[PDB]
């Protein structure tokens, strides 16, 4: 399996809003168990009076949402880190190895 | 200069293909566009699918970094086959490439004009540069399994 | 994680014979002799029972 | 549609090349050894050109005593009636116990 | 009905217009998200 | 030219350990039956699950892989249709012709840690039940962790996935016949015969304790190690024991893993080998007449 992370900072003012992006909750974060596709919104971050400036996925990132945390330091800013989980089977391009240096890509 | 209409993938071994033949999977061939002008026969074939997909019959350039000698830029005929996002070719054809299948990638350049398509299967393709002009002899010799089999067949007796 | 239910090569089900393997390993039996009492003759279905880490007893504390 | 295709070669008289779709080595090895048991089959062999596709190719070069088309039903029914004799022998042996 | 559990405090609190993030009967600033009762499906093959 | 006549002899027959001989046939009848019995005969297995709530330690995609490898029983395995052959019912439910339902529900509220078992899966149809010792463990729940899902099992061919194959180890051997040259046995001494007996990996060659003769006992356990022939080859008696495999008279050691019976495995194999060789000659019959 693979577990990734997508961190962002928030510091008129920038908040964690709805920016209205299909499977999203009211606080700008996807619920646990939503299969996130590519080119979608993983963090709902906007401003007042409808000013949407968020972070979107690339065309090589996918997976489902497992957990999302919220934290804040003593400066007065909040933090967010959405974690994505994907289980990957060994395909025809994975590279194995050994205990003696006999590395090799899967052929068939 | 960096150029468009290219692709970069790792390669694996497949002795089921021909000599001047490679294999592009469906996920790459369903996105790479190759332009070709309209003809009188396929007027009902292009309008029901100019910008068409990478079908069979086309040719693309092959390249392994870095370019060692002149014969490391062979243009081979494409052939689509269902594979999980990896390309494959004949392991006896990797002798001009001077690379193994331990993780080496292959650069792929795709032409679009007809003047860059007819010139590929005339001076660049594998059926034309069959003479290794650095040495003056054959270029595509026997591989690893075929050499041992051709030895054992004639020595075992 | 936990012991797999089937063997990775043969296909014989071995997910149930894990509690009775630790129950026979609690005695003075050898690891090479505790598998003969579970009717395993090939070395394909014996390396699963002989070499397997029990990570769930470390993962259940929290 | 058209699972079995008939292709007749021209350069060799009384010669054919049978091919089927969506099969494996379970038929190309059970038809070749049945054709080799016959005395009117001088050439019998299966070949998988591409394992990514699913299509075997069987080539039959027979003599002038019979057609290469009539030497296929005699090799199919020779297994279709042998499997019935194997089933009738196993069903009594499983009923003995 | 979005919930937000505490880090090691264990108090469930709702985060609406949360300029600062801390649970009520606690002092830490770590808030995990609670899994809802959504229905997902994953095949074995 | 015409067909053959194979002869069998069952040695022992119990559940999932059927052992029978197969005489007067070549290797392409004992191999093209093993290749069907190990991958082609269809059973039922859990394909699609639907997890409602999961609060255990393991992930929600690690359990869906483990739940599909449970050896469910299958008595109506050949009489049911596939998911693609059944265009009706739109999936997702007990159609009673192409699918079946399962209901897992458990929650640990006590102090000690209880683990769920394969005997907790309750199905709506009591003819498709997991076999059962202790049972197959899935998760281990602490005080406050629950698990509830809903599984759907369907008939599938074991060529697609390795969960539908009901044969773990089905193999066959050639059952060779060995011969001992009695005219050259008296050349070697007693210690040479002792050193020739102890050179075999398996118990193939014994010794008569009244006359000191090499007597063949249990010749079916040679396993082709080629250690007895090479021992006498580098000695003072070459060509003493000549071992050659027979072209016929094989033996089968099948295993049916508790899903189907061992008697019904080789019956459903030869009942499908009669229909795999059926659509070939009727589709090539119009080109003959
Ligand atoms: Mg390399
Ligand atoms: Zn095993
Ligand atoms: Zn707290
Ligand atoms: Zn159905």
From Swiss-Prot, chain A:
Known role: DNA-dependent RNA polymerase catalyzes the transcription of DNA into RNA using the four ribonucleoside triphosphates as substrates. Second largest component of RNA polymerases IV and V which mediate short-interfering RNAs (siRNA) accumulation and subsequent RNA-directed DNA methylation-dependent (RdDM) transcriptional gene silencing (TGS) of endogenous repeated sequences, including transposable elements. Proposed to contribute to the polymerase catalytic activity and forms the polymerase active center together with the largest subunit.
UniProt subcellular location: Nucleus
Disruption phenotype: Blocked in the perpetuation of CNN, CG and CNG methylation in repeated endogenous DNA. Reduction of heterochromatin association and methylation into chromocenters, coincident with decondensation and losses in cytosine methylation at pericentromeric major repeats such as 5S gene clusters and AtSN1 retroelements during interphase, independently of siRNA accumulation. Altered cell-to-cell movement of siRNA beyond the vasculature. Reduced 35S promoter homology-dependent transcriptional gene silencing (TGS) in transgenic plants.
Quaternary organization: Component of the RNA polymerase IV and V complexes. Interacts with SSH1, NRPD1 and NRPE1.
Protein name (record): DNA-directed RNA polymerases IV and V subunit 2
Superkingdom of origin: Eukaryota
Signal peptide bounds: none
Coverage span on the entire protein: 803 to 926 of 1172
UniProtKB/Swiss-Prot annotation, chain C:
PANTHER family recorded: DNA-DIRECTED RNA POLYMERASES I, II, AND III SUBUNIT RPABC5 FAMILY MEMBER, DNA-DIRECTED RNA POLYMERASES II, IV AND V SUBUNIT 10
GO biological process per UniProt: DNA-templated transcription
Matches recorded under SUPFAM superfamilies: RNA polymerase subunit RPB10 (SSF46924)
Organism: Arabidopsis thaliana
Subunit structure: Component of the RNA polymerase II, IV and V complexes. Interacts with NRPD1.
Sorted UniProt keywords: DNA-directed RNA polymerase, Metal-binding, Nucleus, Transcription, Zinc
Recorded GO MF terms: DNA binding; DNA-directed RNA polymerase activity; zinc ion binding
Pfam families: RNA_pol_N
Function recorded in the entry: DNA-dependent RNA polymerase catalyzes the transcription of DNA into RNA using the four ribonucleoside triphosphates as substrates. Component of RNA polymerase II which synthesizes mRNA precursors and many functional non-coding RNAs. Pol II is the central component of the basal RNA polymerase II transcription machinery. It is composed of mobile elements that move relative to each other.
GO CC field: RNA polymerase II, core complex; RNA polymerase IV complex; RNA polymerase V complex
Keyword flag Ion transport: no
This protein's encoding gene: NRPB10
Family, per entry: Belongs to the archaeal Rpo10/eukaryotic RPB10 RNA polymerase subunit family.
Name the record gives this protein: DNA-directed RNA polymerases II, IV and V subunit 10
Binding-site positions, Zn(2+): 7, 10, 44-45
NCBIfam families the record matches: PRK04016.1 (NF003089)
Compartments, record wording: Nucleus
Swiss-Prot record, chain D:
Secretion signal span: none
Coiled coil region boundaries: none
Alphabetized UniProt keyword annotations: DNA-directed RNA polymerase, Nucleus, Transcription
Domain of life: Eukaryota
Main location: nucleus
GO biological process: transcription by RNA polymerase II
Subunit text: Component of the RNA polymerase II, IV and V complexes. Interacts with NRPD1, NRPB3 and NRPE3B.
Similarity section: Belongs to the archaeal Rpo11/eukaryotic RPB11/RPC19 RNA polymerase subunit family.
Name used for this protein in its record: DNA-directed RNA polymerases II, IV and V subunit 11
Lineage: Eukaryota, Viridiplantae, Streptophyta, Embryophyta, Tracheophyta
UniProtKB/Swiss-Prot annotation, chain E:
UniProt GO MF annotations: DNA binding; DNA-directed RNA polymerase activity; zinc ion binding
Subcellular location: Nucleus
Primary residence: nucleus
Annotated GO CC locations: RNA polymerase II, core complex; RNA polymerase IV complex
InterPro entries per record: RNAP_P/RPABC4 (IPR006591), RPABC4 (IPR039747), RPABC4/Spt4 (IPR029040)
Metal-binding as UniProt keyword: yes
Binding site for Zn(2+): 6, 9, 23, 26
Keywords on record: DNA-directed RNA polymerase, Metal-binding, Nucleus, Transcription, Zinc
Pfam family, one: Zn_ribbon_RPAB4
Domain of life the protein comes from: Eukaryota
GO biological process: DNA-templated transcription
Function: DNA-dependent RNA polymerase catalyzes the transcription of DNA into RNA using the four ribonucleoside triphosphates as substrates. Component of RNA polymerase II which synthesizes mRNA precursors and many functional non-coding RNAs. Pol II is the central component of the basal RNA polymerase II transcription machinery. It is composed of mobile elements that move relative to each other.
Homology family: Belongs to the archaeal Rpo12/eukaryotic RPC10 RNA polymerase subunit family.
Subunit relationships: Component of the RNA polymerase II, IV and V complexes. Associates with the mediator complex. Interacts with NRPD1.
PANTHER family the record matches: DNA-DIRECTED RNA POLYMERASES I, II, AND III, GEO11084P1
Protein name, per record: DNA-directed RNA polymerases II, IV and V subunit 12
Organism of origin: Arabidopsis thaliana (Mouse-ear cress)
Lineage of origin: Eukaryota, Viridiplantae, Streptophyta, Embryophyta, Tracheophyta
């Amino acid at each position: 399996e693979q577990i990734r992370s997508y961190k962002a900072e928030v510091d008129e003012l920038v908040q964690f809003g709805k920016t209205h992006v299909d499977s999203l909750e009211d606080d700008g974060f996807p619920f646990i168990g939503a299969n996130m596709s590519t080119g979608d919104i993983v963090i709902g971050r906007c401003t007042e009076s409808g000013a949407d400036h968020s972070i979107k996925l690339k065309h090589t990132e996918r997976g489902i949402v497992q957990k999302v945390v919220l934290s804040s330091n003593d400066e007065g800013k909040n933090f967010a880190a959405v974690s994505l989980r994907q289980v990957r089977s060994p395909c025809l391009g994975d590279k194995f190895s050994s205990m003696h240096g006999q590395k090799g890509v899967l052929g068939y | 200069k960096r150029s468009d209409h290219t692709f970069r993938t790792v390669v694996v071994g497949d002795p089921s293909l021909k000599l001047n033949e490679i294999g592009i999977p469906e996920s790459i061939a369903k996105r790479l566009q190759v332009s070709e002008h309209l003809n009188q026969c396929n007027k009902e074939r292009l309008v029901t699918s100019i910008f068409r997909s990478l079908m069979d019959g086309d040719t693309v350039l092959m390249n392994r970094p870095p370019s060692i000698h002149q014969h490391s830029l062979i243009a081979m005929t494409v052939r689509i086959l269902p594979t999980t996002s990896v390309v494959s070719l004949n392991p006896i054809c990797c002798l001009p490439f001077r690379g193994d299948f331990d993780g080496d990638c292959l650069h792929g350049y795709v032409p679009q004009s007809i003047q860059a398509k007819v010139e590929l299967d005339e001076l660049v393709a594998l059926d034309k540069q069959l003479i290794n002009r650095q040495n003056g002899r054959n270029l595509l010799s026997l591989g690893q399994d075929s050499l041992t089999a051709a030895y054992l067949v004639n020595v075992e007796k | 994680m936990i012991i797999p239910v089937r063997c990775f090569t043969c296909g014989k089900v071995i997910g149930n014979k894990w509690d009775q393997y630790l129950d026979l390993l609690q005695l003075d039996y050898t690891e090479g002799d505790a598998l003969d009492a579970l009717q395993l003759v090939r070395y394909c279905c014996r390396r699963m029972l002989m070499t397997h880490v029990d990570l769930i007893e470390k993962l259940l504390n929290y | 549609t058209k699972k079995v295709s008939y292709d007749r070669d021209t350069k060799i008289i009384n010669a054919a090349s049978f091919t089927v779709e969506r099969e494996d080595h379970t038929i190309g090895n059970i038809v070749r050894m049945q054709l080799h048991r016959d005395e009117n089959v001088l050439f019998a062999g299966y070949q998988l050109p591409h394992p990514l596709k699913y299509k075997i190719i069987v080539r039959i070069h027979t003599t002038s005593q019979s057609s290469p088309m009539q030497a296929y039903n005699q090799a199919i029914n020779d297994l279709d009636k042998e499997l019935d004799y194997l089933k009738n022998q196993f069903e009594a042996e499983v009923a003995k116990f | 009905p979005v919930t937000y559990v505490c880090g090691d405090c264990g108090q469930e609190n709702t985060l609406k217009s949360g300029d600062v993030i801390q649970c009520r009967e606690c002092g830490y600033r770590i808030l995990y998200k609670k899994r809802t009762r959504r229905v997902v499906q994953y095949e074995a093959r | 030219t015409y067909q053959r006549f194979p002869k069998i002899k069952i040695r022992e027959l119990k559940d999932d350990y059927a052992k029978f001989e197969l005489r007067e046939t070549d290797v392409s009848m004992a191999n093209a039956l093993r290749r069907v019995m190990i991958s082609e005969v269809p059973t039922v297995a859990i394909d699609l699950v639907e997890i409602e709530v999961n609060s255990s330690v393991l992930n929600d995609e690690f359990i869906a892989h483990r739940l599909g490898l449970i050896p469910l029983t299958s008595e109506r395995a050949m009489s049911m249709r596939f998911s693609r052959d059944c265009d009706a019912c739109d999936g997702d439910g007990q159609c009673e012709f192409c699918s079946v339902e399962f209901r897992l529900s458990s929650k640990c509220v006590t102090d000690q840690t209880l683990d769920v078992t394969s005997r907790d899966l309750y199905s709506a149809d009591p003819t498709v039940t997991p076999v059962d010792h202790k049972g197959i463990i899935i998760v281990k729940l602490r005080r406050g962790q629950e698990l509830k899902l809903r599984a759907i099992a369907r008939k599938g061919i074991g060529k697609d996935h390795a969960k539908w194959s009901p044969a773990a180890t089905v193999t066959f051997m050639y059952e060779p016949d060995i011969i001992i040259n009695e005219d050259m046995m008296d050349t070697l001494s007693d210690e040479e015969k002792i050193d020739l007996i102890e050179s075999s990996p398996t118990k193939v060659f014994g010794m008569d304790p009244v006359t000191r003769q090499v007597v063949v006992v249990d010749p079916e356990a040679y396993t082709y190690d080629e250690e007895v022939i090479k021992k006498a080859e580098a000695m003072g008696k070459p060509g003493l024991i000549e071992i050659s495999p027979k072209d016929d008279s094989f033996i089968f050691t099948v295993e049916s893993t508790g899903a189907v019976k061992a008697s019904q495995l080789v019956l459903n194999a030869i009942d499908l080998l009669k229909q795999k060789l059926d659509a070939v000659r009727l589709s090539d019959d119009t080109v003959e007449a």
